[PDB]
Amino acid sequence: GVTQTPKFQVLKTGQSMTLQCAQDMNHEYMSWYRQDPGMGLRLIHYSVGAGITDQGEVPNGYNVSRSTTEDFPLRLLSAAPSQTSVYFCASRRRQGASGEQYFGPGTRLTVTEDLKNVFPPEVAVFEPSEAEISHTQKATLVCLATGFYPDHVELSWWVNGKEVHSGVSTDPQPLKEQPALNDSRYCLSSRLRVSATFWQNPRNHFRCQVQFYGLSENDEWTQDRAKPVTQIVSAEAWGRADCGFTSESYQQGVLSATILYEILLGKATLYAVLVSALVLMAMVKRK
Amino acid sequence: FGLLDPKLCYLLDGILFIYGVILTALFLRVKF
Amino acid sequence: QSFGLLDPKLCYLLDGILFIYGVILTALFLRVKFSR
Amino acid sequence: QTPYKVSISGTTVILTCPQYPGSEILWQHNDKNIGGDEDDKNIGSDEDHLSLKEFSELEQSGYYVCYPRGSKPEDANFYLYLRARVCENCMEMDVMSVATIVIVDICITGGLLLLVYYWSKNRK
Amino acid sequence: QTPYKVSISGTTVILTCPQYPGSEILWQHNDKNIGGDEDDKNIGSDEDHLSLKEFSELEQSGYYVCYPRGSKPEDANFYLYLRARVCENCMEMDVMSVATIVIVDICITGGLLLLVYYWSKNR
Amino acid sequence: FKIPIEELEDRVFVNCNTSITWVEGTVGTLLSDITRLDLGKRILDPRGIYRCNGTDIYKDKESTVQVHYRMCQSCVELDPATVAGIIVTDVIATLLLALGVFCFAGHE
Amino acid sequence: SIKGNHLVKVYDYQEDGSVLLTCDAEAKNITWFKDGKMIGFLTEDKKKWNLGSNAKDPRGMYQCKGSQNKSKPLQVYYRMCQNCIELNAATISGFLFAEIVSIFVLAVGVYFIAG
Amino acid sequence: VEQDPGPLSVPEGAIVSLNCTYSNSAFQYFMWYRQYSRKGPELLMYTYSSGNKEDGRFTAQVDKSSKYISLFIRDSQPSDSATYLCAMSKGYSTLTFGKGTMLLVSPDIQNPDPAVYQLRDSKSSDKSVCLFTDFDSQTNVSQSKDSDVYITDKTVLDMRSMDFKSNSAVAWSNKSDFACANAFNNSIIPEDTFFPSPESSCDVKLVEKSFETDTNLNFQNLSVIGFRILLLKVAGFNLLMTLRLWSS
């Protein structure tokens, strides 16, 4: 199909960025669309041949280059705060004979005026309450990833080391903490609803992975806190039945049983040794 | 039937071993 | 609900063994009480 | 080379990085520098020790690495994957510690039964 | 319908495909041919047996299928979904068998002690 | 034609595009919609042979899956040395009771 | 962290207590080393080397080899109790009660033998 | 060139009708893209003549005389809530995309039980959430009055196992005097809205439904049974030897 690289990208104002498209179905000509909330898809450049590049609707500040016939990379020589958009690659075979296109998976950019604004997501996993497990008999874990910037998370639920795609709702658009301001901070939530005879095991393990995409190692940082690189922040929880007879009280019950019965077995064997010694001494002293 | 089962098993072990010792004491106080 | 090889039937088998032994000795004690 | 010493006392884990003598030690947990003087005061650091107080199986498990002061942790030669439960006032059950408990109880009760035995023979 | 034979002994899973007469049989797992490379001692192929030695719950589970040589492999329509645990030196032991073991132990003790009773009565 | 045996949270759901015909084994629960058959939990070892038709594709072929689990939890790890230890200590205890009845009946 | 030759990762949390290891290299025949010696010879379809359950507390050095040199080690460690016993008032009271009733039964027995 | 924006809301299992106006030009082909949230626009239908065409459960119609094109959907699942874009151009190049239309298919829930549950904070951060759920699937959940109380919009989580589509919204805050009775005050609230008592319920027979068993517990229980057999046999030996030493 059509691939493009990177997925997410952060960069300071006034900084170049080369973002690559690739197409192995051997269609001829590609285009770069950008998308903003409120204006729809807008064309930037399109390259009808191996080298024949033409401008689109908004070519203002976009160097393209067409050298091969499977790659058409876009370049941003200088950056602007009005560059925050979602970019897309296109793919067409031959000049309106087959009018279909095939869009790539999306490429995001946010451009800050200063790199003291990036933060890692603070992730918390809120366990359900017994009101649900009595009333509806279903439990809803809620993950909150608060405080990150920019909107570059990919939240995912892992149950016993494997993901779940069944019972997970996630907000498509994050909020802002201050919606009136410009350099705000985002907050994303998620709900895992689970049948409440699965939460009551102390053996199941639920965790909320958040794949933050941010700075890289090749970028300077002179600020006191840790440098917020591309990372994974997650919080875990065992399942917990609070009141009842789970398989940990039973573990300690059987361990105390093994202690008491090894002790009692030692008692009875020593009393057997004592009475056998008394019987042997009495049989010596009768014969 | 499944409230806190091992404690019930072992307390029933307890007050039947005590009654076994009391039965042996009855044999020791009746037979001789 | 999955106990497997974990049931209270097994500890209650052993306690039933102690109960049957106690029943036998109490019955023979009461037959001694009948005997004199 | 030389393994990390994970000394667990009660609900307090003391990690010990045996290498790098004399130099100063920094600790990464899951690529996140801890051991410094942050607001978290349940975690202390020493010349070569890491003292984690009130260990939590979910939070404080995972990878660990000691590395010398001012070097790169990806050039360190040794990683640790700690996953440890802790338990307040919880004495474990070794193969031989329980046998020592049994033999101590055997000796105590044998002494008591010998005292009662010679007491009864003196009443005999 | 005649089911597949699954025989699980320790860490050895033996599968047997009954429905074909055979003499040329092939086994496929998760769209991959398995057995028949003259390597992989753990994976043995027989007349109609498949011997998965050191079976692994996480990596060997899924859809097994027998098919004769000549048949294309996506034409077969009887699939096994196998998932199994493989604790080594670890055997299946249900509760009623343990109850009979304890009662048979009691019967052997009572029988031997009554033998001692009668062979001391004879003195 | 793979009948999709999906494994949810701790259950097993046979999915099909049409109604699942039970043949033998665990009966299970037809869900609130048809074309989905719950088989209970996984640790309670659901086994059986199930058969369904195929619509939208496959030209109305009918196929059969055999669901077989061995979630080994009525199982016990045992060394041969530990089995020998249990048997030998049982034999020693029975011989102690034999000598006990012997020495008690000889000197009543 | 697959550069810097830290090629061994652990995939621990699982349905049972099975600890698994993974190595990132040219996957034809991964050769798994514990402590210096050799323990494993892995081909496709296998990817993950096992260590058994985490009740047995699998510890020690681990490393892998692909077609390149050996990886850096990994000290896998576990204190996953499955024997730890909390000292409640109930367990201590039960231990002391069983001890007292045992020594009283044995005391009456010894006192009636050597009476 | 002119597509009607704004999220339209259709109940589950209902024919949805969308249309794009393009008056006027002479366009060859007409085609419909579907874009989910945070993905790329995926193609659905591609026609070239004036009239009707059907693929799957979708229907693309072209009206060159009426000068608008239309998309019809039957059996509208809740899993088709997406932004629909329409595209046409001339014979050569330069596709023209509309602004796209948000389609929200709220479900039919068939057994509503609206309630506001306090959830239990997990000792890491200072927040505390009040999950409000099941809604009658027609409850407009507005935003908040404060700047410390947050509200998410209603989302439809889709349990595949129990087969139970549910609605949810989560309100978290960093402040005192944030109780769940005073949390969703801004939005309209239906009846019977089960605000729970702070005293717990504690169904014990429902905790027993979740009890697994490892191999370690099986073998330790069998070791306990073996020690009970050995206690019975050695105590039988002890009582026989005491009756022997008291009989003589």
Short mmCIF file of N, CA, C and O in Angstrom, two decimals, chain H residues 10 12 16 48 87 121 125 127 179 182 192 196 200 204 214 224 229 245:
data_model
loop_
_atom_site.label_atom_id
_atom_site.label_comp_id
_atom_site.label_asym_id
_atom_site.label_seq_id
_atom_site.Cartn_x
_atom_site.Cartn_y
_atom_site.Cartn_z
N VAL H 10 -27.87 9.46 14.28
CA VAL H 10 -28.81 8.49 13.74
C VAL H 10 -28.93 7.35 14.75
O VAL H 10 -27.91 6.90 15.26
N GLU H 12 -29.48 3.43 16.06
CA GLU H 12 -28.92 2.19 15.55
C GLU H 12 -29.94 1.43 14.72
O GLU H 12 -31.09 1.27 15.13
N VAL H 16 -29.26 5.82 6.73
CA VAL H 16 -28.63 7.13 6.83
C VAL H 16 -28.47 7.69 5.42
O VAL H 16 -28.08 6.96 4.50
N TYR H 48 -18.90 6.35 -11.68
CA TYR H 48 -18.58 7.28 -12.76
C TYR H 48 -19.79 7.73 -13.57
O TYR H 48 -19.63 8.60 -14.43
N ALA H 87 -15.71 13.21 -2.91
CA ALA H 87 -14.65 13.65 -3.80
C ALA H 87 -15.09 13.48 -5.24
O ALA H 87 -15.67 12.46 -5.61
N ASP H 121 -9.55 5.90 44.02
CA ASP H 121 -8.25 6.40 43.61
C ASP H 121 -7.15 5.42 43.97
O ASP H 121 -7.27 4.63 44.91
N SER H 125 -1.95 9.69 42.34
CA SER H 125 -2.29 11.08 42.08
C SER H 125 -3.50 11.47 42.92
O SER H 125 -4.16 10.64 43.54
N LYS H 127 -6.47 12.79 42.19
CA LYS H 127 -7.75 12.93 41.52
C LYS H 127 -8.74 11.89 42.04
O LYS H 127 -8.39 10.97 42.78
N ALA H 179 -18.05 15.83 45.28
CA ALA H 179 -18.75 14.57 45.41
C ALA H 179 -19.54 14.30 44.14
O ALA H 179 -19.84 15.21 43.36
N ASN H 182 -22.71 16.19 43.41
CA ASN H 182 -22.52 17.54 42.91
C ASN H 182 -21.56 17.60 41.73
O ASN H 182 -20.91 18.63 41.52
N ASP H 192 -33.66 8.20 38.58
CA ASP H 192 -33.32 6.99 39.32
C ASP H 192 -31.85 6.56 39.26
O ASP H 192 -31.51 5.59 39.95
N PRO H 196 -24.88 5.75 44.83
CA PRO H 196 -24.75 4.67 45.81
C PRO H 196 -24.53 5.21 47.21
O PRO H 196 -24.06 6.33 47.42
N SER H 200 -20.48 -0.30 51.92
CA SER H 200 -20.24 -1.29 50.88
C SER H 200 -21.33 -2.36 50.88
O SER H 200 -22.13 -2.49 51.81
N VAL H 204 -20.51 -12.01 48.91
CA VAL H 204 -19.46 -13.00 49.11
C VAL H 204 -19.58 -14.13 48.09
O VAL H 204 -18.58 -14.64 47.58
N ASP H 214 -3.72 -22.99 41.16
CA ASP H 214 -2.42 -23.25 40.57
C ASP H 214 -2.06 -24.72 40.82
O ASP H 214 -2.79 -25.45 41.48
N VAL H 224 -0.70 -31.69 52.74
CA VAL H 224 -1.46 -31.60 53.99
C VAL H 224 -2.24 -32.89 54.25
O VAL H 224 -2.27 -33.39 55.39
N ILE H 229 -2.77 -38.24 57.20
CA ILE H 229 -2.69 -39.70 57.26
C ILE H 229 -1.55 -40.16 58.16
O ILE H 229 -1.72 -41.08 58.98
N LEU H 245 1.74 -50.43 77.56
CA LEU H 245 2.50 -50.18 78.77
C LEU H 245 1.63 -49.89 79.99
O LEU H 245 2.16 -49.84 81.10
#
